[PDB]
């Protein structure tokens, strides 16, 4: 019941798409070979738990490479449907001419996938916003559900471009087109980015060869942490839609950022103490979210706290109290409590207390506003346009995309301003 | 499932082919017995143990088909994709575009499409062709022509040894390179300028042998489109594939020539000696001394980066050395692209040929760049066109093979409008 | 019943591969003899022109 | 009691069978020696049991092909009609001058066939539509037999000319005279096509290497499902008329679709439970039908579920009514509720459920007006008329042939637009 | 009970059939002493122990007769099925159809109605008839006449020797060629036009021989007509008998002539490097260049094209190629037939000749195409009939065998008559 669709889609949705699925499999105790040892799995012959998800792209690479890894039995091959002319980091290639030829598939599996559940709660994405492939198929898709299926609820993890040293040069392009359309059809972006992960694996945990690897496993963890508050007992449940309840006032402010706690290194795991304050000293620190906006230079429209470990309640809502009313210009004030929290019952595998700590936050400005400075900065000069335009499509939609994207952070600001 | 072909036109582009093929199979592990005790990119299992490789070489001249048919690799390849003519091309572009190059572009052209037939999911094109030469010029761009004509979508990345400023192997290298160049402008959309003198310094100060000879020179070449292709040959931490290049380092579909570096540069004398860090490895990526192109990349801007990595890589130390070389005072972008790097990262490290003079090492990068100092690198050879067409010399070799005689002003005035765009993009806003 | 079905397919494939290999055998042989035979014939050949024009 | 004297012809005729007399051997646990360890065999001294079956052509190098094949002794000597001189593919030769004047030795032996059974119900006949021998043949046995038994009933498991590429030149001709034979003389008439079975035996069992057996195989595995419902005990058995009854609405819309389940690869059988939904999720696939028309191109205006094995009905009538109003576009509406159910009480041999879909639907009408296009651009040149000429045919009736198949493809194009 | 008589008129059809049983004798396992160590369709048992072959034998040279009457089948044939004459043909016409054969044809008729006598499921006769020739022709024309007002419905295939497009072997030809064409219209079937140029260019090309002969040729053709009868012979998925191409390739009442294909015909080295599936067999044995008769394809429309592939073949692949074959748009066929493909598969894998220069393969296909650019063929004959018909040229060796002059006329005229067809059925409606 409230089942779960899992989307996967582009390289860097595919690699965090096994690592999410390792990190599922170890939760609840489900060894590679496919037994156990309905939130998310599908029972099958035998006992054995097929993953409810779908993978996708243009290129059979790295769904080979998922296939040969660890945990490549579990997804069904009937889910792994791929074109091999390949995308290429252009979204128009990967939107309006290849998108024609798979989506008709892709859907047609995607149906199955839905008719099959009995009630669906909503679904979740994982992709980039850069890469061709990625953002193209991913948003495409995400078009198509949401006509489809209007009920339910959107998640897109998406992972937007590093501010310094870019993956892709054409990458602004791209993510502007990806964010005016995911603005459109869907309830949360939440955002990643890598320098921040590079920044929390050098700084809490003192891995010093930071390897994919361990930046997958990480949002990973947050990933699962999202909604375990609902396939557990729970002092105080939740769900998906709760927290889209508690945490958008208005459906364009729908842009979150992420932070997940503790984390330590292993010489510092033996003296740190594992108790809700500083729990709370984390999850509250600028350099411990993954996020390229420094969360003091902001403020907070609503921030929820998933809590995991079978501790107090007295101290989690007290902690919470003070962490509003004293920080109260770091917050926002026409709004009463703007801080919501939910506990579930059971911890994660390695420790005994967990936060995942979402916000819809209002400093994710600086980054939209850094991604439309490049814009301009490319666009006012034609560059890189003979791709996004021998594709069927002229430069109208750009700048109106653009438009849109400039009355998005348009709202945040203001609403940063207003007293009452 | 996913492949490339693989053509061979011209003297230089047969040899560098050799060589590069060579590094193709001792990489995999494959013998020149065709017997083998990923490949899908290059070769193709015939049935039951033996492997054909996806090639043709195309050259007038018997000499070197004759040898690559009587050498080593004797057993390799189909005995049909080794096509030979009868006649020199004598480095007048036109014999090799109009008289004879009627000839035997048909049969590539056949040989071609029972080729790429036999193919799932082909990507691109890889040219390999010598401009200064006869047949590495006027064959290669009727072929250039004919594919465009057929197949289109389909990427082409030719890698062709434009003449040294300073160094000369021939006296009529601006003409048939003026045709060639005015040819290939549209039809190839990335075309990586690859030298043939900077090679020369660059293993006399690294490599430190004084009399190098062509065939390192191909080994070197061999050596970094082996380090391309390896996105599409191997697996990686970020897979690249070749229709990524032709979309990131394309600003505007005329001003696509880009010049290449390749490091770790080092014989073994000095490789136990010297550390190669990662951001020591991308600072000499970056030096003026070891691009491949004749050019000091500090006259002009560069406009995109792409950075390959293979073997063992750690990111964060990549990120840290490329901020780095970004706020390096002695590189700098165009205004209009912040975004300048593009970056690609594999699982493998690189493979070394006995008897090549470089060294085994963990880390390679390769890195290409659409940049705009190459420009001058035109203007000077431009210069000696004018020298030459001031007294219609060597013309009558031209205007004797059917080519009409005002043709090159033509061709000249194009590269002049080449040379515009090239100053239309290094100015601010 | 998945299992069998699983390794008659795998054997079937086996048997595919075996007769090819059988017929690059026969086909090795074949380019063999035919070499063979073109030696042999300019033998042959160079025999009948010395008996023609060692006719006095 | 209710028994079947199954008559083939022609090539495709000859294999079916064939394939289709093992897959029944192989059901009531025979041996090619013929005994066991009324329907369909018949006993004979010493316990042997021999097929109620005639086969007959013009060529006798088909029975040397069928007798020599495992499962082939069976077959009494004293049927196998075979003509000594020739076929050619050519309808007018198997129907006026060559394949017609032996025609009487065949009714000589259906009715020694026939007149020895006690309550004979129908005949079940399998041919091809464009072989010469078999589609001449089939239609002038056709004709003679139901001018002459009107008591019992008809039943062809035809084969459609390949629709994107054919395997004869001739292949329109053959098929609109038989045509013109079928909807004034048969009473139930099923087609399969040689293309769809290709792309099922590829996309849905990944095979490499898919032998005409196997497709046959295929055939002759739903052409038992059908009847299966009869010679078995069931919670509501059906038989040859039931389905003539409950789905014919008017006697010319009698060109059914045939579908089988469940069909399943290795990996995508490793994976998949088998569970009632799941054979309903894969029965209305139009990637499932043995006959190239894509159904989402019309709707149905009827179709019968002949389940087999045991199962709760109630999940049967669960599924029917789900599938029934979710696609309520892809049903036809003045007939309510135009899908039947049947249960028979016997799995196949060696799984635990079964399906078979037998569909009039009108979106099979659009093959015949490619057949429609064809002929017609055979017709105003003349090609290939002068060998059919050349048997004493008059082209009169090739005219009305053609303009009776008009009427067919316009009575369903009548239908799947009437609304009430 | 079913089978086939096979007659060889002339002098290249004693040759091509002798080679045809040798590769029949040498694939049924029967030694060429008629002895054992399928048959029904060809040879048959005289009782017991040894086998005794289908045919008749005709010649007026008693040289190749005698040749085959003391060569390595001595003891094959029965002594009685060998006719040959006293005197020669000498390449007209008339020699072989008013003089000579004016009662050898009664031998021969009743020679064959004593083998009929014994045939239970004949199905057509498969003549061979060197038509450049002098009795092939003339005397080929009457034998086929004399069948066909004597038995009448069995279809008469045809395998006939043309004259070349270019080279020479013979200069009256054009008289007595047209001749038997004019002869051939309506009494034969199925013409399959078979011409000396193409397949030296092929044994030239593709089987590596550079000095070929007609022992390679008729090798070749022996290879053609037993890949074309495996259907009656051995097993196959999807049989054909040959009363199939009687209604399948013949639209119109008069235009029946058609052109031969084969493949694989690859030698050892150049398909031992090589994949070989279904895909390129199919997509080269439409190719214009190894058709066994001589024309362009390419610049004319299909009309019918059987294929029987035998060997182990998958017939997935056999759908998807002729789909992919038929997608092409310079392979396009007329108005009135859309549905231009036949297939048939046989289980029998090509078996080959020992001591042969083709090479063993698994798949392999043969085509028989109805096409309309053959038309252009006769045309150029005929134009060179004229160019010996402007001044009556060697018409006296003709006119002085009691052959009425006027009917070159008709022929000559009639034969152009039929252009009318040509011409017409190219035009769509
Ligand atoms: N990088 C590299 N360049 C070569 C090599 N061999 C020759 N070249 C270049 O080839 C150019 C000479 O022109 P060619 O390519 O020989 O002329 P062609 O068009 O092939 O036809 P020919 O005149 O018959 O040789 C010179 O610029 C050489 O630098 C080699 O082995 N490696
Ligand atoms: N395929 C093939 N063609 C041949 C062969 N021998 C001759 N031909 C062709 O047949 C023609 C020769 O004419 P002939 O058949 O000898 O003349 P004829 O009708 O027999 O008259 P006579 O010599 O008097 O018996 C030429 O076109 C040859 O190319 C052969 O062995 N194989
Ligand atoms: N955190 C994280 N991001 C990744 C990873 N791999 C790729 N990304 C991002 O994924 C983007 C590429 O998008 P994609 O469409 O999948 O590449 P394409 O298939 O070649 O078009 C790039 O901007 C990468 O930065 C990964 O392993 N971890
Ligand atoms: N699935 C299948 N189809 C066959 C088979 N044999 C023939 N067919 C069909 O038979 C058609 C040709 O007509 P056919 O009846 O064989 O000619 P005839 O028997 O000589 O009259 C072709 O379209 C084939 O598809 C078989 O064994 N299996
Ligand atoms: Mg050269
Ligand atoms: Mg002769």
């Given at each position: 019941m409230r089942e779960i669709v899992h989307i996967q889609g582009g390289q860097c949705g595919?690699?965090?798409?096994?690592?999410?699925?390792?990190?599922?499999?170890?939760?609840?105790?489900?060894?590679?070979?496919?037994?156990?040892?309905?939130?998310?799995?599908?029972?099958?012959?035998?006992?054995?738990?097929?993953?409810?998800?779908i993978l996708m792209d243009l290129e059979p690479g790295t769904m080979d490479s998922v296939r040969a890894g660890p945990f490549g039995q579990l997804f069904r091959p009937d889910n792994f449907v791929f074109g091999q002319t390949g995308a290429g980091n252009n979204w128009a290639k990967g939107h309006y001419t290849e998108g024609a030829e798979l989506i008709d598939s892709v859907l047609d599996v995607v149906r199955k996938e839905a008719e099959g559940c009995d009630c669906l709660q909503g679904f979740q994405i994982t992709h980039s916003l850069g890469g061709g492939t990625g953002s193209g198929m991913g948003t495409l898709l995400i078009s198509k559900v949401?006509?489809?299926?209007?009920?339910?609820?959107?998640?897109?993890?998406?992972?937007?471009?590093?501010?310094?040293?870019?993956?892709?040069?054409?990458?602004?392009?791209?993510?502007?087109?990806?964010?005016?359309?995911?603005?459109?059809?869907?309830?949360?972006?939440?955002?990643?980015?890598?320098?921040?992960?590079?920044?929390?694996?050098?700084?809490?945990?003192?891995?010093?060869?930071?390897?994919?690897?361990?930046?997958?496993?990480?949002?990973?963890?947050?990933?699962?942490?999202?909604?375990?508050?609902?396939?557990?007992?729970?002092?105080?449940?939740?769900?998906?839609?709760?927290?889209?309840?508690?945490?958008i006032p208005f459906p364009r402010l729908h842009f979150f950022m992420i932070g997940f706690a503790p984390l330590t290194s292993?010489?510092?795991?033996?003296?740190?103490?594992?108790?809700?304050?500083?729990?709370?000293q984390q999850m509250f620190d600028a350099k411990n979210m993954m996020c390229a906006a420094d969360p003091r230079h902001g403020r907070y429209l609503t921030a929820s706290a998933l809590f995991r470990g079978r501790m107090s309640t007295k101290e989690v809502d007290e902690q919470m109290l003070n962490v509003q009313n004293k920080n109260s210009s770091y917050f926002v004030e026409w709004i009463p409590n703007n801080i919501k929290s939910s506990i579930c019952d059971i911890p994660p595998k390695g420790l005994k207390m967990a936060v995942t700590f979402v916000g819809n936050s209002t400093a994710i400005?600086?980054?939209?506003?850094?991604?439309?400075?490049?814009?301009?900065?490319?666009?006012?000069?034609?560059?890189?346009?003979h791709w996004y335009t021998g594709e069927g499509m002229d430069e109208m939609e750009f700048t109106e995309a653009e438009s849109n994207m400039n009355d998005l952070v348009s709202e945040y600001q203001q609403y940063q301003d207003a007293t009452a | 499932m996913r492949e490339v072909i693989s053509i061979h036109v011209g003297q230089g582009g047969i040899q560098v082919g050799n060589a590069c093929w060579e590094l193709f199979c001792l990489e995999h592990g494959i013998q020149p017995d065709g017997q083998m005790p990923a490949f899908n990119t290059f070769f193709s299992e015939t049935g039951a143990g033996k492997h054909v490789p996806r090639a043709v070489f195309l050259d007038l001249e018997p000499t070197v088909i004759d040898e690559v048919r009587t050498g080593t690799y004797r057993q390799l390849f189909?005995?049909?994709?080794?096509?030979?003519?009868?006649?020199?091309?004598?480095?007048?572009?036109?014999?090799?575009?109009?008289?004879?190059?009627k000839e035997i572009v048909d049969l590539c052209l056949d040989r071609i499409r029972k080729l790429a037939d036999n193919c799932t999911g082909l990507q691109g094109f890889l040219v390999f062709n010598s401009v200064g030469g006869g047949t590495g010029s006027g064959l290669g761009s009727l072929l250039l022509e004919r594919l465009s004509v057929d197949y289109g979508k389909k990427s082409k990345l030719g890698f062709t040894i434009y003449p040294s400023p300073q160094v000369s192997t021939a006296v009529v290298e601006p003409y048939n390179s003026i045709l060639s160049?005015?040819?290939?402008?549209?039809?190839?959309?990335?075309?990586?300028?690859?030298?043939?003198?900077?090679?020369?310094?660059?293993?006399?100060?690294?490599?430190?042998?004084?009399?190098?000879?062509?065939?390192?020179?191909?080994?070197?070449?061999?050596?970094?489109?082996?380090?391309?292709?390896?996105?599409?040959?191997?697996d990686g931490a970020l897979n690249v594939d070749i229709t990524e290049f032709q979309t990131n380092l394309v600003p505007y579909p005329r001003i696509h020539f880009m010049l290449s570096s390749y490091a770790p540069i080092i014989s073994a004398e000095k490789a136990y000696h010297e550390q190669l860090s990662v951001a020591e490895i991308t600072n000499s990526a970056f030096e003026p001394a070891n691009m491949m192109a004749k050019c000091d990349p500090r006259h002009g801007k560069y406009m995109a980066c792409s950075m390959m990595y293979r073997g063992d890589v750690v990111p964060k130390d990549v990120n840290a050395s490329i901020a780095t070389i970004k706020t390096k005072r002695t590189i700098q972008f165009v205004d209009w692209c912040p975004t300048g790097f593009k970056v690609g990262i594999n699982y493998q490290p690189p493979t070394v040929v006995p008897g090549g003079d470089l060294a085994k090492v963990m880390r390679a990068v390769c890195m290409i760049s659409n940049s705009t100092a190459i420009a001058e690198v035109f203007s000077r050879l431009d210069h000696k066109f004018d020298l030459m067409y001031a007294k219609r010399a060597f013309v009558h070799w031209y205007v004797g093979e059917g080519m009409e005689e005002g043709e090159f002003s033509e061709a000249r005035e194009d590269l002049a409008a080449l040379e515009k765009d090239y100053e239309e993009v290094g100015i601010e806003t | 019943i998945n299992m069998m079905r699983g390794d008659l397919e795998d054997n079937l494939n086996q048997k595919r591969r075996n007769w090819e290999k059988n017929t690059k055998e026969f086909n090795i042989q074949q380019?063999?003899?035919?070499?063979?035979?073109?030696?042999?014939?300019?033998?042959?050949?160079?025999?009948?022109?010395?008996?023609?024009?060692?006719?006095?």
């Open positions: 595919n690699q965090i798409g096994a690592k999410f699925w390792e990190v599922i499999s170890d939760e609840h105790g489900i060894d590679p070979t496919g037994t156990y040892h309905n939130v998310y799995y599908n029972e099958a012959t035998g006992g054995r738990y097929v993953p409810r998800a949401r006509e489809e299926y209007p009920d339910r609820i959107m998640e897109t993890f998406s992972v937007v471009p590093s501010p310094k040293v870019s993956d892709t040069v054409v990458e602004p392009y791209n993510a502007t087109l990806s964010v005016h359309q995911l603005v459109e059809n869907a309830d949360e972006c939440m955002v990643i980015d890598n320098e921040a992960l590079y920044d929390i694996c050098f700084r809490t945990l003192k891995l010093t060869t930071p390897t994919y690897g361990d930046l997958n496993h990480l949002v990973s963890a947050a990933m699962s942490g999202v909604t375990c508050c609902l396939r557990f007992p729970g002092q105080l449940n939740s769900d998906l839609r709760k927290l889209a309840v508690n945490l292993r010489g510092s795991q033996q003296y740190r103490a594992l108790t809700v304050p500083e729990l709370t400005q600086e980054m939209f506003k850094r991604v439309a400075e490049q814009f301009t900065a490319m666009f006012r000069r034609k560059a890189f346009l | 189909h005995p049909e994709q080794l096509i030979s003519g009868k006649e020199d091309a004598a480095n007048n572009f036109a014999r090799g575009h109009y008289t004879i190059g160049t005015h040819s290939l402008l549209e039809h190839t959309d990335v075309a990586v300028m690859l030298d043939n003198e900077a090679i020369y310094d660059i293993c006399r100060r690294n490599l430190d042998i004084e009399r190098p000879t062509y065939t390192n020179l191909n080994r070197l070449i061999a050596q970094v489109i082996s380090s391309l292709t390896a996105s599409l040959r191997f | 380019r063999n003899e035919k070499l063979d035979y073109e030696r042999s014939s300019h033998l042959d050949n160079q025999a009948q022109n010395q008996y023609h024009i060692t006719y006095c």
